[PDB]
């Protein structure tokens, strides 16, 4: 049955004999995308049509094609040819990383800048980093990735440890030539290992932490069936992944009593983008979008017990296509486990004698992912009490350059002549609302100061409003943390037992949105970075927040072109984009590698239930 | 030696014994405070001397006295008589909790207001409430409480489902007097009970939860010694316990190599005041400060194992004084242990093939107190990576009123007939810094945005700014969430290996500070709840944001008084206060009892360690 379950090899194997059979998979084909769609709205009344969209690059320059094949029926739904000036280049692909220093080892230009530097070619590696969308009109429909270089003394060395700065290369990476080498002066090679393993660097290792046991002797509370389905403590969903977006939760649904009610549609991360604040030359074009450009699905890591993911785990293998079509196997890539969250809900009453404690718990669902120096955690967690929370960890190597004699005002020094760029992570959360059901309407919510004087003559007053979110054109809002101001998604139409509609609120951390100045190709490529929250009127064909083809692309999709149909959202199906991020000045505390640090939001039950729903809850 | 070590029975009973002998401690008298002094600054060589400050109450009707006595000396340091209608109040005594109900019982007005209603006095609950200042004359001087009443339909039933709104009383707990009773007319008492123990509310209880068992079979990794010095991975702390203040940190250092390095000299919640909104006659006065007036140490919970703190726990039992100086214990009043914290750091390397993965920890010191209807958990955290977090937890169960028919722009409807006036709940870290010892200074961080054009030309660049803050008068500061708006407490002649000054930074949630109209006496008395920040010069007598007595005290006393003497902290010993709280609007699953929400701040490194202080966790 399950129509929301997890592709199997099969099915991917399927996709490329279908692929095969109807003549658009040859062996200069290369798949730079896989994932199955969603089912459509009222789809469950009728026959499972198991779909899947990919992507098809070709490395002997003819032009990319987007397909829709039904591996139901084993047949091809679609095939049109894309033009990527116009619609923008494909993802990066695994098979393209290697390719900038292997062109960039033979070319003169680039043996001169590293012979003047004295380092061995080599020795020397090379990022490869999205190129976004510049001045070169020359670069308009070419598949282009820039390189920055980084020494590499040994085999088992941190090259991020020596950044070769005033020195970057761009690439096209199907002709296979070097369109640019710009060398603006030699900066010194900072000296310094960052070899985080090396007893040197670390000392000692610490000998004073003892075990921490944590188990379950009678196995998790939560049940997997179908593959991917989850049933906890009233919660109802399914786990998907994607290629692009990684771990995507389905059908968010809370059990009130006999009634299954949804809540969320669909979650995701549609989009995260890493923007560098350093006017520099040799890095100002940089901006990567993990989830657009890169895919972070396909990076995932293999998890490993007590290591990653600790307790009673229990691991879903997502399958992904490799280039040619092959399923391969993420295992465990993805955890999943119960944990213990503190008090839940205590009071000891005086006049009733009554001492009362409930500890909490939180269904935990997680990946994490590797891009280059970057590594990140995606950890979407349901509570209890209705809560539904997402967090981002941060962590990896930070991306280094030189520190400038004199210093800096966008980088930071972490090392003696090692320097770190200013830059921000910022996540877009993509949240198919579905609050009893999909007919909602959003309202900003702001705290109310009132003035002392007649009705409120002691001046101790507070209130609230609330305003309705009708029309996209409305529904581009900013944060306010001054005045606590909160978005709440209600249902008109179902009302709790105090004859109001039923609601979630979303409470955001209001960190700094995106900074770059709004005339900037970011600000137009990242343009959901630019607020903190959207509501859009759900489409089909309205997936990421910065469209689907984003490598290479200029403005002309994405939130804006969506928010410009001004469509009705007041109690229809919609859709809410939430931007959250992390502005980064390095420390001195994240070099060699660094500390986790996080960002996140929490939506919480507004009025959706009938009084607290954890009064059953057992000691 | 240990001059931080907890207050023993025997030093209260020495304590006693001393006043007893000065002549200071009769029949009469009645301890409303007692707490051990801090050591003076300087202080090594020089031998203990245990000294502890003692409020007497005078239930006779004379003047209280402020004392400090020398338990090491046996003597009598200084007696103040205090004039209460000048420098405040003594804080409410648990034994005036009872009177309130006790006098109205008999009282004539408030037997015609209950018969008015239909209620037996003998079923009917009056919650002893402070006072504050407002526009009663008589009051000034007097030791008052306000009554506010609660049906309890049997011995175990919740009275707080069954408000009696429109009607309050004030009485004088010294003379035993009513002073005025108030009736502006019946509302109806909410019907439906709250009892969240009664199988007929939580209907059957789950027994879907599995056990999770969190173990440590070699024991926990701190070690505790002199009964309260906390070592643990590479943190050191004496854990102290006060009246008013509850859990207070001192010494709170790191041990980076061979060097114990200070970084917060205290860490205490000085203040919290819980504003009420609601402009009613019957609760516009409603502000409880809860440490200030009540004490909330005093009524720290036992904690029971496997309940409140689950794990390997190690407790501290403090021991306070009670109404006549005799020493009493609060078994396992304060819990400690270490637990799991996810992922410390983690990266996979393309280039060195390393991979890496790290787990993080947290140190966990705790308490729980109990304040009438409310009950909120105090949570100290220490991380590996040198992260100082607080954490309050707000449950217990929502102060209560009736729901207005029509509705109410400042009370929320919960169950039939029954509201919930809007609130805060803020609190005031004093944080006395010694970042690397004493001479410190404090800097306001802005994130900067720039402009496109010259030095900008892809308009990507962004900085930030930070601003000395000299002297007091420059030192009150609001968030600012936008602009990403943090404090770095600095030692400005202790560097870092790259020549920077070693620092902390304070990262706040920017939550809304007080919401009354500056012109309330709320406004004037939690004049530290107005601001995110404030900075002084450190002295022994400023040791409360709302100064030593706030009960039925105006303005004149704490942060506003400090700030004007506008002294020196430019690099000098000085103290942080952080106000930071919750704006409530309770919501249907708030009731019958509340799930816990949360609010906090933490300190992170920020050039303090020359690297990653956590290179030395093993796998
Ligand atoms: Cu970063
Ligand atoms: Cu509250
Ligand atoms: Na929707
Ligand atoms: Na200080």
Redesign the interface.
């Given at each position: 049955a399950s129509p929301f379950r997890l592709a199997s090899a099969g099915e991917i194997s399927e996709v490329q004999g279908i692929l095969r059979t109807a003549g658009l998979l040859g062996p200069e084909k290369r798949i730079a995308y896989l994932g199955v769609l969603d089912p459509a709205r009222g789809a469950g009344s009728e026959a499972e049509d198991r779909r899947f969209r990919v992507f098809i690059h070709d490395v002997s320059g003819a032009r990319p094609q987007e397909v829709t094949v039904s591996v139901t029926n084993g047949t091809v739904i679609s095939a049109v040819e894309l033009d990527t000036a116009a619609t923008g280049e494909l993802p990066v692909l695994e098979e393209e990383?290697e390719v900038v220093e292997q062109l960039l080892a033979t070319d003169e230009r680039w043996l001169k800048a590293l012979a003047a530097r004295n380092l061995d070619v080599s020795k020397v590696?090379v990022a490869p980093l999205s190129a976004g969308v510049?001045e070169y009109a020359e670069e308009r429909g070419r598949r282009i990735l820039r390189g920055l270089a980084?020494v590499?003394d040994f085999?088992?060395?941190?090259?991020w440890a020596h950044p070769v700065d005033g020195l970057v290369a761009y690439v096209d990476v199907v002709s296979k030539e070097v369109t640019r080498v710009i060398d603006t002066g030699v900066f010194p090679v900072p000296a310094e290992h960052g070899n985080?393993?090396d007893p040197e660097?670390?000392?000692?290792?610490?000998t004073?932490?003892?075990?921490?046991?944590?188990?379950?002797?009678?196995?998790?509370?939560f049940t997997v069936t179908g593959g991917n389905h989850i049933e906890w403590?009233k919660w109802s969903l399914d786990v998907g992944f994607d290629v692009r977006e990684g771990v995507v939760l389905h059908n968010i649904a809370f059990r009130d009593g006999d009634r299954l009610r949804p809540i969320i549609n669909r979650a995701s991360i549609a989009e995260m983008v890493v923007?560098?604040?350093?006017?520099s030359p040799i890095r100002?074009?940089?901006?990567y979008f993990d989830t657009g450009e890169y895919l972070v699905g396909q990076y995932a890591?293999s998890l490993?017990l007590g290591?990653?993911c600790?307790?009673d785990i229990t691991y879903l293998s997502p399958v992904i296509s490799d280039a040619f079509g092959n399923p391969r196997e993420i295992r465990n890539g993805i955890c999943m486990h119960?944990?213990?969250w503190?008090?839940?809900?205590?009071?000891?009453?005086?006049?009733?004698?009554?001492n009362?404690?409930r500890?909490?718990?939180r269904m935990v669902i997680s990946f994490?992912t590797?891009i280059?120096?970057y590594?990140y955690?995606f950890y979407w967690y349901l509570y209890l009490?209705?809560t539904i929370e997402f967090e981002a960890?941060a962590?990896?190597?930070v991306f280094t350059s030189a520190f400038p004699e004199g210093g800096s005002?966008?980088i930071s020094?972490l090392?003696?002549g090692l320097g770190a760029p200013?830059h921000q992570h910022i996540f877009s959360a993509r949240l198919d609302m579905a609050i009893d059901g999909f007919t909602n309407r959003v309202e900003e919510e702001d705290?109310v100061?009132?003035?002392?004087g007649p009705?409120?003559?002691?001046?101790?007053?507070?209130?609230?409003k609330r305003t309705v979110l009708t029309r996209e054109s409305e529904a581009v809002r900013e944060?306010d943390?001054?005045?606590?101001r909160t978005w709440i998604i209600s249902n008109p139409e179902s009302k709790?037992r105090?004859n109001?509609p039923v609601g979630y609120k979303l409470h955001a951390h209001?960190?700094?949105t995106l900074?770059?100045?709004?005339?900037?190709?970011?600000?137009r490529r990242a343009a959901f970075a630019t607020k903190d929250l959207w509501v859009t009127r759900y489409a089909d064909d309205e997936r990421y927040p910065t469209g689907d083809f984003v490598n290479q692309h200029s403005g002309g999709a994405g939130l804006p072109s969506y928010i410009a149909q001004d469509r009705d959202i007041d109690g229809q199906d919609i859709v809410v984009w939430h931007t959250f991020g992390l502005?980064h000045?390095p420390?001195?505390?994240?070099?060699?590698?660094?500390?986790?640090d996080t960002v996140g939001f929490k939506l919480?039950?507004?009025?959706?239930?009938?009084?607290?729903?954890?009064?059953?809850?057992?000691?």
């Open positions: 990383f590696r510049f980084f590499q085999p088992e060395d941190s090259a985080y393993t660097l670390t000392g000692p290792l610490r004073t932490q003892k075990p921490i046991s944590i188990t379950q002797p009678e196995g998790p509370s403590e923007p560098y604040g350093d006017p100002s074009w940089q901006n890591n490993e290591c990653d600790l307790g119960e944990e213990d503190g008090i839940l809900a205590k009071h000891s009453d005086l006049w009733s004698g009554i009362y404690t500890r909490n718990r994490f590797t280059g120096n590594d955690g009490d209705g960890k962590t990896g190597v005002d966008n020094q090392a003696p200013f705290v100061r009132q003035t002392m009705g409120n003559e002691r001046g101790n007053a507070f209130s609230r944060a943390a001054r005045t606590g709790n105090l109001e209001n960190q700094p900074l770059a100045d709004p005339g900037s190709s970011i600000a502005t000045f420390r001195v505390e994240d070099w060699p590698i660094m500390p986790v919480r039950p507004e009025g959706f239930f009938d009084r607290s729903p954890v009064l059953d809850v057992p000691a």
